[PDB]
Design a protein around this ligand. Structure first.
Ligand SMILES: Nc1ncnc2c1ncn2[C@@H]1O[C@H](CSCC[C@H](N)C(=O)O)[C@@H](O)[C@H]1O
Ligand SMILES: Nc1ncnc2c1ncn2[C@@H]1O[C@H](CSCC[C@H](N)C(=O)O)[C@@H](O)[C@H]1O
Ligand SMILES: Nc1nc2ccc(Cl)cc2[nH]1
Ligand SMILES: Nc1nc2ccc(Cl)cc2[nH]1
Lengths: 268, 257
């Protein structure tokens, strides 16, 4: 059928996306409490740490798809890639990342996340060093639209194809229905070299979340649907794990039932 | 001794626990070395019990970060009221407290139990039951009827004895005195400056007995300890800052026998 209408709806909804509210909702306590090892925060970081610790995900360039105003998803990644590209649809998010990159006081504080990352990586690294290296290795912050066949546009900056892709809470959050999800996945897959790796994190069975005034509509997806999409796009699924959201972390910022983590390798 | 009446806690913290000495990112610094010594010692599991006393805490708490998960009742002590107040400010999370969070973070890093630094500080604050005056020059350093559970299962002391003793003999006695607070078979973790003769604390200029590792070893033996461990950190040029003339730092793990 037609993809344009659904996309138009999504673009419109995101015009009201408030980064600060989003940050507060998902990365300040209770959800941003990294002290309880059973929490979603530590689980996400652990998934990323453990994956990179295999040494099997490495290369020169990495692209983060739909970064929004967050960097946690790159904390463990940055020691394995010399060149990192962050991306987002919204200017306001790219500016938010801009604040952090200039190490401004007005910037969101990720130090709890950096420290926890250092803690679990177990190399005795101090968090200031981890942050310094991430800031060094982020070579650009670019506009992206995953609904386009060329999500970064034509003749874009990013070194293509990338050795690896990271994406957290983007695809299912910007896709009206499963078919759109699949196409978005196909689009970003063109950015990844054959044999390259994708680390995908996302919400399970979620239909809405809040970003301030904006209450955005999300395609609820299951683990099996995520698996099948990955196979459909030419990936071998190396890892796919599920975190079930504890009642006490279900706070009304959304209706998320769980979180998935996928480590997939593009077939080459 | 009267020199200690001029001792400024803020200037002491600044001189010794703020950059460069207080930058914990470089693992070859004195800070990480000290924390590692304490962490490794407690990780053996051989230093345990219910009560522990920190001798001459001053306004610092780093020396207890790794200890606190092994002792449910902790007594901190200093000779100066201003230091006990400074401790109070951190223990009670009052305004103007010193920021020890980097040290807590690094202890969690080193201990490698995946513990968040806030839980660590929470536990330390919880287990420190009392902050008492003390004078290691007195045969009973805590006095007659102290609220501290005696005898303790374990002792910690860092940069106190050598810093309050005019000479080697005073050092030995101070050590004898504090040893009377320790239950036989108990443990002492002693940290100190090597070959230091002075250090500054704001307007205060303190005199230190310069001691060597062998002199430290011999004193412990004379006080009736079996030295389980004695290590030395040689002070790098870049940490020689004009606040003192320390040449190295020693760490001793001794068991009263
Ligand atoms: N068409 C599109 N293509 C790519 N990203 C889009 C998009 N439309 C919206 N987005 C971005 O989708 C993001 C989802 S929020 C996820 C933020 C972050 N990656 C996390 O891990 O918390 C928003 O930042 C939003 O700006
Ligand atoms: N007679 C005495 N008995 C016990 N402590 C004394 C003392 N005279 C001075 N002190 C204390 O000795 C401390 C030395 S500074 C050491 C502080 C801390 N333990 C550290 O690891 O940094 C000072 O706080 C000082 O008040
Ligand atoms: N959209 C979205 N971002 C999120 C970040 C964390 C969690 Cl638990 C759920 C989320 N859902
Ligand atoms: N009292 C005292 N604390 C110190 C911490 C570090 C060094 Cl190098 C010397 C010290 N001397």
């Amino acid at each position: 059928p037609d993809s344009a209408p659904g996309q138009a709806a999504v673009a419109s909804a995101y015009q009201r996306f408030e980064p600060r509210a989003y940050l507060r909702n998902n990365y300040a306590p209770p959800r941003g409490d990294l002290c309880n090892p059973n929490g979603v925060g530590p689980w996400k970081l652990r998934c990323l740490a453990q994956t990179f610790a295999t040494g099997e995900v490495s290369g020169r360039t990495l692209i983060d798809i739909g970064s929004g105003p967050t960097v946690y998803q790159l904390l463990s990644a940055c020691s394995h890639f010399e060149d990192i590209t962050m991306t987002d649809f919204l200017e306001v998010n790219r500016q938010e990342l801009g604040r952090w990159l200039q190490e401004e006081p007005g910037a969101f504080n990720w130090s709890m996340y950096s420290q926890h990352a250092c803690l679990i990586e177990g190399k005795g690294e101090c968090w200031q060093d981890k942050e310094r290296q991430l800031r060094a290795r982020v070579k650009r912050v670019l506009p992206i639209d995953v609904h386009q066949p060329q999500p970064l546009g034509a003749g874009s900056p990013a070194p293509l194809p990338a050795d690896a892709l990271v994406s957290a809470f983007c695809l299912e959050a910007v896709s009206p229905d499963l078919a759109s999800f699949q196409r978005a996945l196909d689009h970003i897959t063109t950015l990844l070299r054959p044999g390259g790796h994708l680390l995908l994190i996302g919400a399970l069975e979620e239909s809405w979340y809040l970003a301030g005034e904006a209450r955005l509509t999300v395609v609820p997806v299951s683990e099996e649907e995520v698996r099948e999409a990955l196979v459909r796009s030419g990936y071998k699924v190396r890892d796919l794990r599920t975190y079930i959201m504890p009642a006490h972390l279900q706070t009304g910022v959304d209706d998320v039932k769980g979180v998935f983590f996928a480590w997939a390798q593009k077939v080459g």
